[PDB]
Amino acid sequence: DTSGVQGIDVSHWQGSINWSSVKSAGMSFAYIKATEGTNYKDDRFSANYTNAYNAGIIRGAYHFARPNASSGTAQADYFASNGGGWSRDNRTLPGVLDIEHNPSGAMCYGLSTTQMRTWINDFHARYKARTTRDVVIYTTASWWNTCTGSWNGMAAKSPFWVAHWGVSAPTVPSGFPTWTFWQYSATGRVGGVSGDVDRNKFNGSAARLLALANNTA
Numbered sequence: 001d002t003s004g005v006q007g008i009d010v011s012h013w014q015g016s017i018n019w020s021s022v023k024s025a026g027m028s029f030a031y032i033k034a035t036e037g038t039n040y041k042d043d044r045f046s047a048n049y050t051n052a053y054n055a056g057i058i059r060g061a062y063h064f065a066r067p068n069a070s071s072g073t074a075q076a077d078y079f080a081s082n083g084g085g086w087s088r089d090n091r092t093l094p095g096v097l098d099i100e101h102n103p104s105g106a107m108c109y110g111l112s113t114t115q116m117r118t119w120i121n122d123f124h125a126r127y128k129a130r131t132t133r134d135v136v137i138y139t140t141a142s143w144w145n146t147c148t149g150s151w152n153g154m155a156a157k158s159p160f161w162v163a164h165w166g167v168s169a170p171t172v173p174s175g176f177p178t179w180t181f182w183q184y185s186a187t188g189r190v191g192g193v194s195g196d197v198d199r200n201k202f203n204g205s206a207a208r209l210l211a212l213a214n215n216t217a
């Protein structure tokens with residue numbers, strides 16, 4: 001759904017990005033990969049974070065979780081110290097916890113549903129202690145339901161960024177009251193980015209997006 005407030009998310013896979021072109025293409029926001037696990041740092045993060053801001057894009061950072069590698073508390077601190085920090089400046093979104101299918105091992109990272117709930121709660125608690133913000137959770141409905149056992153525990157704690165490509169509207173797990181961001185394509189096109197780009201829609205007005213960035217709503 002390309003209507004209303006639109007954005008993209010990128011990582012080093014997108015290479016060199018011309019953010020002024022992303023902005024002139026009509027994008028309002030972007031999430032940029034910063035860290036993964038305990039010691040991976042996206043090589044394009046600093047430049048993207050700087051250039052997106054200078055181009056006037058409301059932007060934030062995301063952490064790709066590896067729950068098997070360390071506690072939720074540990075990865076939240078790592079993220080907050082390496083790109084996930086937040087402060088009010090009209091252009092910084094609250095950080096994102098990208099927790100999804102394990103790319104190298106059991107899909108739920110060897111954690112029981114109860115341990116996974118604890119891990120996510122710990123990441124949220126530490127990220128909030130570090131930044132004052134409620135971390136945004138990026139995941140798929142399948143992963144959420146399977147690995148957390150259809151948990152409703154984050155409904156009042158974390159905005160939901162749902163990944164559901166190729167559908168007219170996203171399916172939302174019962175554990176979230178609604179979706180805040182929705183990644184509807186991983187094969188889009190946007191000026192300034194060469195090749196496939198992830199496209200996102202924000203569930204609300206331009207003012208609501210700014211309020212989310214500034215922590216006023």
Ligand SMILES: [Cl-]
Nearest residue numbers: 002188189190
């Ligand atoms: Cl289009």
Ligand SMILES: [Cl-]
Nearest residue numbers: 024025190191
């Ligand atoms: Cl364009």
Ligand SMILES: [Cl-]
Nearest residue numbers: 038070074075
């Ligand atoms: Cl860590």
Ligand SMILES: [Cl-]
Nearest residue numbers: 068105106109
């Ligand atoms: Cl694992």
Ligand SMILES: [Cl-]
Nearest residue numbers: 132133134215
């Ligand atoms: Cl918040």
Ligand SMILES: [Cl-]
Nearest residue numbers: 150151152153
């Ligand atoms: Cl529940």
Ligand SMILES: [Cl-]
Nearest residue numbers: 168169170179
């Ligand atoms: Cl909807």
Ligand SMILES: [Cl-]
Nearest residue numbers: 187188189190
């Ligand atoms: Cl497109």
